[PDB]
Design a protein around this ligand. Structure first.
Ligand SMILES: *[C@@H]1O[C@H](CO)[C@@H](O[C@@H]2O[C@H](CO)[C@@H](O[C@@H]3O[C@H](CO[C@H]4O[C@H](CO)[C@@H](O)[C@H](O)[C@@H]4O)[C@@H](O)[C@H](O[C@H]4O[C@H](CO)[C@@H](O)[C@H](O)[C@@H]4O)[C@@H]3O)[C@H](O)[C@H]2NC(C)=O)[C@H](O)[C@H]1NC(C)=O
Ligand SMILES: *[C@@H]1O[C@H](CO)[C@@H](O)[C@H](O)[C@H]1NC(C)=O
Ligand SMILES: *[C@@H]1O[C@H](CO)[C@@H](O)[C@H](O)[C@H]1NC(C)=O
Ligand SMILES: *[C@@H]1O[C@H](CO)[C@@H](O)[C@H](O)[C@H]1NC(C)=O
Ligand SMILES: *[C@@H]1O[C@H](CO)[C@@H](O)[C@H](O)[C@H]1NC(C)=O
Ligand SMILES: *[C@@H]1O[C@H](CO)[C@@H](O)[C@H](O)[C@H]1NC(C)=O
Length: 336
């Protein structure tokens, strides 16, 4: 159980102008062409997704990616003002693998319902993690991995309402967000199957109810905070989308097609550090991301629930939680 400096590996192509590729060609080595996995027999190891230095390293790398790929024109902090060249770039996240250096291995939990904190009974050793897209978002976790058997609820302590709940879905729900070619260059929309979304919500609700027996599970919109957190926010092709999810986080959801209104914003509250980053107006043309919703970030309301209802609202903002949603099954160990 030691802290070491992981290295990254990817399939980035040197000819590719896409920024994640450009960053990874310099920062990472090539993906392991022949990866070996060794099942450890009759072995139990403790994992803690909430105290895992792998998360802090990924955070540093995504910050480094965004420093190259999403350079704001103006960056404001309470101690600083920066004005700089801010060219548009080609942006589409690629998978990144995190790898143990010599004298260290990465243990991988293979229990398919492991909650991320406690003993794992089916462990194997790997050199590198599977490829993980560094997708930055709030509310909905996009383009990540699915739970194999059932929905998994992950929290440092479910009884602490202040702690984020990471939900991992078993079945993904598609979301297509589009700023059409064109009147209002900042208006966009997402389309999602209400049938599929509603089924996901119902399954997540049933899993939550197992931890709050005799309580009715309600989903509601965020109580307040920055727009990054009160909307589903993500970057699509270099543009910052803010998508209203009032249609999603409700107790009555239609089985028809749901349309979410979105805005593209130039002024964003940064996740990397406290401050504002100001970007140039959106590129021309159709901007579209079709993504798989593979998880949720939820916060449960605190206080006496007079109604016998537990209320859950979408949340996010600390992108370490995004990385935890993928790194929960891994831990770095010193071989000897
Ligand atoms: C979640 O994950 C999904 C994928 O799993 C992401 O969706 C992908 O988004 C990328 C880019 O945003 C898509 O790739 C782009 O596709 C464009 C069209 O591709 C079709 O048409 C071309 C041309 O005929 C075919 O060759 C191709 O096979 C497809 O049939 C391309 O035009 C793009 O390439 C262009 O720009 C690049 C920039 O580097 C240039 O190098 C190229 O020369 C070219 O000009 C690009 O390849 C991809 O298709 C999407 N996948 C799916 C399944 O939709 C989501 O964006 C992601 N969500 C988030 C939030 O990150
Ligand atoms: C800037 O903000 C941080 C916390 O966000 C605070 O600790 C620091 O004192 C602030 N500095 C100034 C000059 O306001
Ligand atoms: C995986 O570990 C969890 C947590 O103890 C346990 O409930 C479950 O039975 C385990 N699954 C298997 C297949 O051993
Ligand atoms: C729901 O998901 C299934 C597969 O996951 C897909 O075939 C179907 O088209 C989706 N429903 C809608 C309305 O898009
Ligand atoms: C989302 O849209 C609903 C209905 O138009 C509105 O009441 C709510 O204030 C919006 N939320 C955000 C964060 O835009
Ligand atoms: C969708 O919901 C309506 C009622 O709101 C119902 O009549 C219809 O059968 C449902 N469709 C499916 C495929 O479940």
């Amino acid at each position: 159980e030691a802290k070491t400096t992981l290295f990254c590996a990817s399939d980035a192509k040197a000819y590719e102008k896409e920024c994640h590729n450009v960053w990874a060609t310099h920062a990472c080595v090539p993906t392991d062409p022949n990866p070996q996995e060794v099942v450890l027999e009759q072995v139990t190891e403790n994992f803690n997704m909430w105290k895992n230095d792998m998360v802090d390293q990924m955070q540093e790398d995504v910050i480094s990616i965004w420093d190259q790929c999403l350079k704001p024109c103006v960056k404001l902090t309470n101690t600083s003002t920066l004005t700089q060249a801010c060219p548009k770039v080609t942006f589409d996240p690629i998978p990144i693998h995190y790898c143990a250096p010599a004298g260290y291995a990465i243990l991988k939990c293979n229990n398919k319902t492991f909650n991320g904190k406690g003993p794992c009974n089916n462990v194997s050793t790997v050199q590198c993690t599977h490829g993980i897209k560094p997708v930055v978002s709030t509310q909905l976790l996009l383009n990540g991995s699915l739970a194999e058997e059932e929905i998994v609820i992950r929290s440092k302590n479910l009884r602490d309402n202040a702690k984020i709940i990471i939900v991992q879905l078993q079945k993904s729900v598609e979301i297509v967000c589009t700023r059409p070619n064109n009147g209002d260059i900042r208006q966009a929309y997402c389309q999602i199957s209400g049938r599929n979304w509603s089924e996901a919500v119902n399954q997540v609700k049933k899993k939550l109810k197992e931890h709050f027996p005799h309580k009715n599970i309600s989903f509601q919109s965020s109580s307040g905070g920055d727009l990054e957190i009160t909307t589903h926010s993500f970057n699509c092709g270099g543009e910052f989308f803010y998508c209203n999810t009032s249609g999603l986080f409700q107790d009555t959801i239609s089985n028809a097609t749901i349309m979410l209104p979105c805005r593209i914003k130039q002024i964003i509250n940064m996740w990397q550090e406290v401050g504002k980053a100001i970007y140039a107006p959106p590129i021309k043309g159709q901007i579209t991301c079709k993504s798989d919703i593979t998880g949720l970030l939820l916060l449960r309301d605190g206080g006496d629930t007079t109604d016998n209802t537990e209320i859950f609202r979408p949340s996010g903002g600390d992108m370490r939680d995004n990385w935890r949603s993928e790194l929960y099954k891994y831990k770095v160990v010193e071989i000897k």
